[PDB]
Amino acid sequence: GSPDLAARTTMFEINVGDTPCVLTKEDYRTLGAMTEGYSGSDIAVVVKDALMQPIRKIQSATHFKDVSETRKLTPCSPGDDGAIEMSPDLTIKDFLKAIKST
Amino acid sequence: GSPDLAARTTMFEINVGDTPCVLTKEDYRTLGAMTEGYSGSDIAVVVKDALMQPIRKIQSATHFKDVSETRKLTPCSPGDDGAIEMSPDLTIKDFLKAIKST
Amino acid sequence: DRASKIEQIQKLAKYAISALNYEDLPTAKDELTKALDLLNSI
Amino acid sequence: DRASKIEQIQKLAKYAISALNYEDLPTAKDELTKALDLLNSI
């Protein structure tokens, strides 16, 4: 038998561990259910894919905005006040993406 | 004084040398004039940029068509008979591109 | 869907770009369109 | 021009893609348009 939304909740925790983020418990409860029928390796892969995301955002997105400490430019649409054409945080939305892409 | 469409013609030759292509003399006469006021390093850079092109075509273009010997897929639009979504020759048009991009 | 529709526009707009690399205006004017219509379908 | 107009559509269609990476439909529906109109200007 595989983890049950309960065992899958903690699995997401463990793999994230200390990695600087802010998914509140609420968020994990969600990713636990999204994964009904998933396995440890699965959920574990899943989380490895998320992350490496904040990095992809800055790798592909060529347009950074300043949110500054002195200065701190990051990936932005360009219709965001200040978009500076030139080549971020782990929201629950990031773990969301890598759910489909796997 | 700098090369004069005559000296610039040969300069394009020299830098291409043996590199497998087919720009007939006609074509060189053209790139010689396009370069009015250019220098040796210039024309020389120019040619280094062209080439590395046939390679870029296959690096960015994700869609290859079969023109086969057994099989020989290459970069194609996808509205070209057979486009196979999956990740060429040096026409005068290639030296043309790197004239603007420099 | 949606999370995907938003992903397929990009898929289109890429092909379109890739197409202009052969000056193929036909394909382009089409994919860059199938894409736009879909961003309105959002 | 033209050799550039064809190059600026791609420039647009890229920004558009880059924009959907923040779900910014506004920018997108615009750049993916300024681009298309221009492919007809060709």
Q: Which domain holds residue B85?
A: 1-102
Subunits next to A (3 or more Cβ pairs <8 Å) are C, D
Subunits next to B (3 or more Cβ pairs <8 Å) are C, D
For residue A34, count CB atoms less than 10 angstroms from its CB and return exposed for 0-12, middle for 13-18, buried for 19 or more. Answer: middle
Resolution value in angstroms: 3.1
A43 and A88 Cβ atoms separated by less than 8 Å: no
A100: number of CA atoms within 13 Å, CB side?
Answer: 10
User: CA of C17 to nearest chain D CA: how many angstroms apart?
Assistant: 5
A66 and A36 Cβ atoms separated by less than 8 Å: no
Taking an 8 Å cut-off on Cβ atoms, the answer to whether A62 and D19 are in contact is no
Q: What is the tally of structural domains in chain D?
A: 1
CA separation (Å) from B33 to B7, B38, B101?
A: 10, 10, 17
Query: How far apart are alpha carbons D25 and A96 in whole angstroms?
Result: 19
Helix D25-41 and helix C25-41, axial crossing angle in degrees, nearest 10: 150
The per-type count for chain A, helices as H runs and strands as E runs, is 5, 2
Q: What is the tally of structural domains in chain B?
A: 1
Mutate: best of C12, C14, C15, C23, partner B, most B CBs <10 A: C15
Nearest CA-CA partner of B10 in D36, B35, B22, C20: B35
Neighbours of A41 (CB within 10 A): 9
Taking an 8 Å cut-off on Cβ atoms, the answer to whether B78 and C21 are in contact is no
B74 and B13 Cβ atoms separated by less than 8 Å: no
Residue linked to tokens 């382009």: C28
B66 and B73 Cβ atoms separated by less than 8 Å: yes
Query: How far apart are alpha carbons A75 and A89 in whole angstroms?
Result: 11
Q: Which residues of B78-95 are buried (b: 16+ CB within 10 A; e: fewer)?
A: bbbeebeeeeeebebebb
Type of residue numbered A99: I
Taking an 8 Å cut-off on Cβ atoms, the answer to whether C16 and D13 are in contact is yes
At residue B19's C-alpha, the angle toward residues B18 and B25, to 5°, is 70
Nearest CA-CA partner of B50 in B92, B100, B94, B101: B94
Neighbours of A36 (CB within 10 A): 11
Q: Which domain holds residue D38?
A: 1-42
B15: tokens are: 């830098």
Query: How far apart are alpha carbons B26 and A30 in whole angstroms?
Result: 67
B95 and C35 Cβ atoms separated by less than 8 Å: no
Nearest CA-CA partner of D16 in D35, D38, D39, D41: D35
Q: Tell me how far apart the 2 most distant CA atoms of chain C are, in Å.
A: 32
Beta bridge partners of C35: none
Tell whether B71 lies on the interface with D, counting CB pairs under 8 A: no
Experimental technique, in short, is X-ray
CA separation (Å) from A95 to A7, A91, B8, C6, D19?
A: 17, 8, 57, 17, 20
B63 and B78 Cβ atoms separated by less than 8 Å: yes
For residue C38, count CB atoms less than 10 angstroms from its CB and return exposed for 0-12, middle for 13-18, buried for 19 or more. Answer: middle
CATH number at residue D30: 1.20.5.420
C23: tokens are: 């000056």
The per-type count for chain C, helices as H runs and strands as E runs, is 2, 0
The sign of the torsion formed by the CA atoms of A86, A90, A94, A99 equals positive
Query: How far apart are alpha carbons B46 and B54 in whole angstroms?
Result: 15
CA separation (Å) from D16 to A75, C17, C39, D12?
A: 14, 12, 11, 6
Query: How far apart are alpha carbons A16 and B98 in whole angstroms?
Result: 47
Query: How far apart are alpha carbons A34 and A27 in whole angstroms?
Result: 11
User: CA of A97 to nearest chain C CA: how many angstroms apart?
Assistant: 8
SS (H, E, C) chain B: CCCCCCHHHHHHHHHHCCCCCCCCHHHHHHHHHHCCCCCHHHHHHHHHHCCCHHHHHHHHCCCEEECCCCCCEEECCCCCCCCECCCCCCCHHHHHHHHHCC
Distance of CA B66 to the CA centre of its chain: 21
Kindly report the backbone phi and psi dihedral angles of residue B21, in degrees, each rounded to the nearest multiple of 5, phi listed first.
Answer: -155, -165
First vs last C-alpha separation in chain C: 10
B74 and B68 Cβ atoms separated by less than 8 Å: no
CATH number at residue A18: 1.10.8.60
Taking an 8 Å cut-off on Cβ atoms, the answer to whether C21 and B75 are in contact is yes
CA separation (Å) from A37 to A16, A66, B6, B63, B92?
A: 20, 42, 73, 36, 58
Kindly report the backbone phi and psi dihedral angles of residue A66, in degrees, each rounded to the nearest multiple of 5, phi listed first.
Answer: -100, 125
